[PDB]
Amino acid sequence: LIRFPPISPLEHHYLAGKSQLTYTDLAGDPALIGNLPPREISYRDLFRDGRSGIKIKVAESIWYRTHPDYVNFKYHDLHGFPFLDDAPGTSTGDNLQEAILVRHQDYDACFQSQQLLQWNKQARYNVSVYRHMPTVRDSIMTS
Amino acid sequence: TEANPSNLNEDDARYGFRCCHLKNIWSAPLPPETKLAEEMGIESNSIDIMGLQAAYAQLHTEQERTYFMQRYRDVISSFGGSTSYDADNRPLLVMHTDFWASGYDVDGTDQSSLGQFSGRVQQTFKHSVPRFFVPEHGVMMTLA
């Protein structure tokens, strides 16, 4: 299974996207972070061209537990970079599962030519197996 | 927040502002606006137990604040952070001394004052500020 970390010139920090920054968002007050319910937000809240129909339930102040990769919007349209140049799920409709599952076409853009699909490999598989197996001589010989 | 010494009243201007009595049950009550009950709305027939949970949490932040974090600096200390004295413009306390003022009695000795006493309180004291570095122009005020 070959995959590319989903970097995207369209994703931004959750907090950069919030319109009304509240104490609960910024403060990072523990008392709150441990007793609030999950938060429903949409891809629109994470990518500029994010689909608002894709809703996700994240854990409070999770944006304070991890930072996202960054790609200057300039690479956004240069063919040849394996970045997601379009918010995930942009062409699958308001459907979460379809956004989460990797859409291989999302990468067609950056390859000179898939004469051998997108990836390919060759290897030697050395397998040794002990087992009860009469010799070929025994099989072909009757008596 | 008086703007000029002239906005101060007779007593204040001449003797200084009044301060709090030493702390005791009746002079150190919880701030007058202390919550005695926290209400939480509920749909006509059900209650969101998850909300109730948050409700408490929220309350907790409110209480902590009312009880002891009313000053910005103290809230920040709450997080395990700190603030310079420039942050909220607080005067910097350089030295604090405290002591009891005792003295003696003077015995009355004439026909009518014999067996009477007058208390003369007279206490000696030292108040010493260790070498302090003044980073910017200003004043070093010492009050009693």
HEC string of A73-130?
Answer: HHHHHCCCCCCCCCCCCCCCCCCHHHHHCCCHHHHHHHCCCCECECCCCCCCCCCCCC
The encoded tokens of residue A20 equal 């009304």
Tell me the C-alpha distance between B66 and B59, whole Å: 10
HSE-CB for B17 with a 13 A CA cutoff:
8
Q: Which residue on chain B is closest to A29 by alpha carbon? A: B79
Buried-state track A90-116, b at ≥16 Cβ within 10 A, e below 16:
bebeeebeebeeebeebbeeeeeeeee
Q: φ and ψ at A55, to 5 degrees?
A: -100, 145
Buried-state track A11-21, b at ≥16 Cβ within 10 A, e below 16:
bbebeebeeee
- B83 Cα to chain A: minimum distance (Å): 16
- The amino acid at residue B36 is L
Tell me the C-alpha distance between A52 and B109, whole Å: 97
Positive or negative, the CA dihedral A69, A71, A73, A77 is negative
- The amino acid at residue B19 is C
Q: Does B51 lie at the interface with A, CB-CB under 8 angstroms? A: yes
Task: Tell me if residue A41 falls in helix, strand or coil.
Answer: strand
Q: Is residue A32 within 8 Å of residue B57, measured between CB atoms? A: yes
Q: Which residue on chain A is closest to B63 by alpha carbon? A: A31
Cβ-proximal residues to A50 (8 Å cutoff; 6+ apart), any chain: A10, A42, A43, A44, A87
Q: Which of B60, B93, B40, A24 is nearest to B68 (CA)?
A: B60
- B79 Cα to chain A: minimum distance (Å): 8
The encoded tokens of residue B40 equal 């939480």
Listing DSSP states for B74-103 in one string gives HHHHHTT----TTTTTPPPP---------E
Q: φ and ψ at A40, to 5 degrees?
A: -95, 125
Q: Which residue on chain B is closest to A33 by alpha carbon? A: B57
- The amino acid at residue A59 is A
Identify all chain A residues contacting B54, using CB atoms and an 8 Å cutoff: 32, 35-37
**Yes or no, beta carbons of B57 and A37 under 8 Å apart:** no
Q: Which of A71, A68, A69, A88 is nearest to A9 (CA)?
A: A71
- Exp. method: X-ray
Q: Is residue B141 within 8 Å of residue B127, measured between CB atoms? A: no
Q: Is residue A96 within 8 Å of residue A54, measured between CB atoms? A: yes
Q: Does B60 lie at the interface with A, CB-CB under 8 angstroms? A: yes
Resolution to 1 decimal place, in Å: 3.5
Q: How far is CA B127 from CA A7, A88, B22, B131, in A?
A: 65, 70, 21, 13
The residue assigned the tokens 């309180």 is B121
Cβ-proximal residues to A41 (8 Å cutoff; 6+ apart), any chain: A14, A55, A56, A58
Adjacent-strand bridge partners of A111: none
Positive or negative, the CA dihedral B65, B66, B67, B73 is positive
The encoded tokens of residue A104 equal 């291989």
HSE-CB for A111 with a 13 A CA cutoff:
12
Q: Is residue A59 within 8 Å of residue A41, measured between CB atoms? A: no
Tell me the C-alpha distance between A102 and A106, whole Å: 8
Residues 76-115 of B with CB under 8 A from A: 79
Identify all chain B residues contacting A37, using CB atoms and an 8 Å cutoff: 50-51, 54
The residue assigned the tokens 């319109």 is A19
Tell me the C-alpha distance between B75 and A29, whole Å: 11
Radius of gyration of chain A (CA): 25
| Residue to substitute from A29, A32, A33, interface B, most B β-carbons within 10 A | A29
**Yes or no, beta carbons of A36 and B54 under 8 Å apart:** yes
**Which conformational region is residue A80 in: left (phi greater than 0), alpha (psi within -120 to 50 degrees), or beta?**
left
CA torsion A40→A43→A48→A52, rounded to 10°?
A: -80
Tell me the C-alpha distance between B7 and A69, whole Å: 59
**Yes or no, beta carbons of A32 and B51 under 8 Å apart:** no
| Residue to substitute from B52, B60, B61, interface A, most A β-carbons within 10 A | B61
Task: Tell me if residue A57 falls in helix, strand or coil.
Answer: strand
The encoded tokens of residue A132 equal 């009860």
CB atoms under 10 Å from CB of A4, counted, come to 14
Q: Does B40 lie at the interface with A, CB-CB under 8 angstroms? A: no
